[PDB]
Amino acid sequence: SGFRKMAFPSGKVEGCMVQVTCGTTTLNGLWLDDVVYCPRHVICTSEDMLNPNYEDLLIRKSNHNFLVQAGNVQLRVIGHSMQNCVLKLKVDTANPKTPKYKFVRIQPGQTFSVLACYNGSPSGVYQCAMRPNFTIKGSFLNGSCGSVGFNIDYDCVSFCYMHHMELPTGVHAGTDLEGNFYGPFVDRQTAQAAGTDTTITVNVLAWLYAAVINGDRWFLNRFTTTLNDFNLVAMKYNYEPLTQDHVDILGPLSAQTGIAVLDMCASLKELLQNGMNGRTILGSALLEDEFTPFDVVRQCS
Amino acid sequence: SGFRKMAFPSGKVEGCMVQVTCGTTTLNGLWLDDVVYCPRHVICTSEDMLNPNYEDLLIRKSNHNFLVQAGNVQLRVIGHSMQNCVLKLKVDTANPKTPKYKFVRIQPGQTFSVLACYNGSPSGVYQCAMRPNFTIKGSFLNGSCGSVGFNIDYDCVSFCYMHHMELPTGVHAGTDLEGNFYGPFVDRQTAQAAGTDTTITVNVLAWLYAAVINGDRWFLNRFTTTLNDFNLVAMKYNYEPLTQDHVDILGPLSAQTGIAVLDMCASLKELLQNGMNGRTILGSALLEDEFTPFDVVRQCS
């Protein structure tokens, strides 16, 4: 029993982290088979970041301008290309520690682990959610660029995220491993608006189910409610709309606890309308939304 | 910028996890050089756990009664011994993935990473604190016994914790890697009292310093206070007494923020006496105590 925000074991990803340098800039890259992937802004100076023409800046670079270091080993670059906002450096050796992997583009509200890295060396691991507005609230100090987010299915690593930048607001933005940004962001140091962020309703409900399984039941109510009634309450509190697809994903958890989803929505409604009166749920004084239904099921199982 | 509860990268520990079976019971072991370490209650049935005589139960066992499996590999046991509450199985091969390691016994209020494992295979990693009452609030399902807690100093892994049991209260208890329990607990399925748990004051202060560095300053006050005045407030709120050793450890953080420790205690006092008025600090509605001063410094650096 008990409930912690758990990350995937990071070992399979640690063996893929490398350091990439172009000119003066050093950041993290991901070495898989004979390709190294890193943020294309590695080729920019701090002055370039105001308004970079990446194609033009990349033109000034040849294979020998890219220093790729894996531990103490030096890799030889035999090709370079830009794919969207990522650089792909073809190297002459396959990474012997390449795990089974896929590149996936995750959906807002899904969770993943981040291995935060500096100069190609891992420093820490944490679990987070992609926010509905396609930002992440991470821990990214200078030189963490190129650190990656991932999920693990027994032996396959699904890479879903590469860190690129901190917005002026302090939240973080990045790409999938094909270099397409999540959300409206660009790799340019300019003012950039993230949308209003909403709370991930299906995750909150999943976590409430986690709480019941673990013995916290005070929030359970006499009331029930309807999908439209609840969504009225959600819209007011900047919770994302709950759909029947969400209700269905919560099915196994409803089965385990014997609590119907709409009964649990009515508890959430009262929570939203009345607050927590200084009480806690699973040790938290706020409604937690970075556990998916899948996360809760896997941790309990 | 930004602040997350970060665990150490788990790779060095993943390569040490094995599965140990004696009779019907299977749990996790730690394979380092040519020794496997696991909880001695691996040799107990569920009936044995009421009141086990470990010496007598161990007598009925010989080397070939202990099945040690590392992935698909099978290890050969050439010796067994009981050290306090841990069994040490001498095997015929050194673990080739043995990192540089030490065994350390940590102090209450210090933090470490846990690799939660089931049948010798890792499932998740999280960061936690040893509570002042020598329990941990973990995530330990059936078969997590023998999962280990650790810190990492660049390349050395310092093992500090092995999980043994869940108390009837839902909190967890375990040993150092010499088999000495943290706290008053025994490896017996009987009612066991944990002391009153207190909040780790020096960690809360460290986290407040983290908050200032990250831009949350609302809690900063006009007041200051004294060590004895503050400790009056701490005792009332079940916070552990703050000493000059603690004030000193907070020195680097006081230097970075230009805020004297006692000024920050006065902010904490007002927080403790007035609550948070529905506000948050670093995204939390409660005062967080599982970051040490060292944790905060390392993450900011």
UniProtKB/Swiss-Prot annotation, chains A, B:
Q: Give the recorded effect for N142A.
A: Does not affect ability to cleave and inactivate human TRMT1
Write down the superkingdom of origin.
Viruses
Which residues does the entry place in the Cytoplasmic compartment? 1-301
Q: According to the UniProt record, what happens if one changes C145A?
A: Complete loss of 3C-like proteinase nsp5 cleavage
Outcome (variant: Q189A): Does not affect ability to cleave and inactivate human TRMT1
Q: Which reactions are catalysed by this chain?
A: TSAVLQ-|-SGFRK-NH2 and SGVTFQ-|-GKFKK the two peptides corresponding to the two self-cleavage sites of the SARS 3C-like proteinase are the two most reactive peptide substrates. The enzyme exhibits a strong preference for substrates containing Gln at P1 position and Leu at P2 position
Q: How is its activity regulated?
A: Inhibited by pyridone-containing alpha-ketoamides compounds 13a and 13b. In turn, alpha-ketoamide 13b (tert-butyl (1-((S)-1-(((S)-4-(benzylamino)-3,4-dioxo-1-((S)-2-oxopyrrolidin-3-yl)butan-2-yl)amino)-3-cyclopropyl-1-oxopropan-2-yl)-2-oxo-1,2-dihydropyridin-3-yl)carbamate) inhibits SARS-CoV-2 replication in human lung cells. Inhibited ex vivo by michael acceptor inhibitor N3. Inhibited ex vivo by compound 11a and 11b.
Q: Where is the Peptidase C30 domain?
A: 1-301
The listed locations are: Host cytoplasm; Host Golgi apparatus; Host nucleus
User: Which part of the chain holds the cross-link Glycyl lysine isopeptide (Lys-Gly) (interchain with G-Cter in ubiquitin)?
Assistant: K5, K90
- Active-site feature positions: H41, C145
Leader sequence residues: none
Its quaternary organisation is:
3CL-PRO exists as monomer and homodimer. Only the homodimer shows catalytic activity. Interacts with host FBXO22; this interaction promotes the proteasomal degradation of nsp5.
Its function, per the record, reads: Cleaves the C-terminus of replicase polyprotein at 11 sites. Recognizes substrates containing the core sequence [ILMVF]-Q-|-[SGACN]. Cleaves and inactivates human TRMT1, preventing tRNA guanine(26)-dimethylation of tRNAs. May cleave human NLRP1 in lung epithelial cells, thereby activating the NLRP1 inflammasome pathway. May cleave human GSDMD, triggering alternative GSDME-mediated epithelial cell death upon activation of the NLRP1 inflammasome, which may enhance the release interleukins 1B, 6, 16 and 18. Also able to bind an ADP-ribose-1''-phosphate (ADRP).
Put simply, this protein is called 3C-like proteinase nsp5
Query: What is the protein's species of origin?
Result: Severe acute respiratory syndrome coronavirus 2 (2019-nCoV)
Q: Shown portion of the whole protein?
A: 3264 to 3564 of 4405
